[PDB]
Amino acid sequence: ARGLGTARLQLVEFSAFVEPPDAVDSYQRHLFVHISQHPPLESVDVRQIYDKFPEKKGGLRELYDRGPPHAFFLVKFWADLNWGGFYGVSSQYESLEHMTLTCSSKVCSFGKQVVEKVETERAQLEDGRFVYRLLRSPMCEYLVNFLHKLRQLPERYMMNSVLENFTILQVVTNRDTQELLLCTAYVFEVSTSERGAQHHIYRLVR
Numbered sequence: 001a002r003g004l005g006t007a008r009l010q011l012v013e014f015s016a017f018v019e020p021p022d023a024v025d026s027y028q029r030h031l032f033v034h035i036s037q038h039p040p041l042e043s044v045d046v047r048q049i050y051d052k053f054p055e056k057k058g059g060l061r062e063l064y065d066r067g068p069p070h071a072f073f074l075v076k077f078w079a080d081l082n083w084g085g086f087y088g089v090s091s092q093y094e095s096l097e098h099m100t101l102t103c104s105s106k107v108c109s110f111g112k113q114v115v116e117k118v119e120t121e122r123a124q125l126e127d128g129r130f131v132y133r134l135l136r137s138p139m140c141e142y143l144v145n146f147l148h149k150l151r152q153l154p155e156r157y158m159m160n161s162v163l164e165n166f167t168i169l170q171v172v173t174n175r176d177t178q179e180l181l182l183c184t185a186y187v188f189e190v191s192t193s194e195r196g197a198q199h200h201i202y203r204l205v206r
């Protein structure tokens, strides 16, 4: 494993962004967080993050026990909060098999899951491989609201205290066979005001 994905399914691109209202006159967009995938990864023992993802029904521990462990990843984001406008999300997956994907995204605060988003995406055959595009999707309102409140905070260390208790758990399944294809745990810090967004992908091990 050398990227975010397995032998069956790769997450090739993901962006959470805002376009300022004057993007019509001169186009610009700000990337809060971004993964671009257009030597093996470091590992992280899944026991360490078990408390950040609530030990509740359907949670990370339960899924990880079920396996297969090669499908489980941790992504650390350093979010760029230095920027109303259009708040948007884009993602792209690739596979070599034709599948219908069910993508579940669970947003958690402290212990509890707060919101969940479920999407189904069909494959398009492009150049021998199957692509799953969900581009320019409207960012869910809970997180648009979270970002506005987050950047009202007066100190960088306060944003990290808030983001310490903030996680996203993503589960991609083959809708027709119900087998898990990918499970990614997302944890967050704020990047210093000088540095743009950055990310690091780990394999989850036990």
Ligand SMILES: N#C[C@@H]1CCN(C(=O)c2cnn3c(=O)cc(-c4ccc(C5CCCCC5)cc4)[nH]c23)C1
Pocket: 014, 016, 032, 033, 079, 080, 089, 090, 091, 105, 117, 138, 139, 140, 143, 168, 170, 186, 188
């Ligand atoms: N992490 C993640 C996974 C990666 C793939 N994901 C999606 O494909 C996806 C789908 N729907 N959707 C949303 O409506 C909102 C977000 C989103 C917005 C803002 C931030 C914020 C960034 C700054 C710090 C607070 C969170 C983080 C995430 N991501 C996604 C979500």
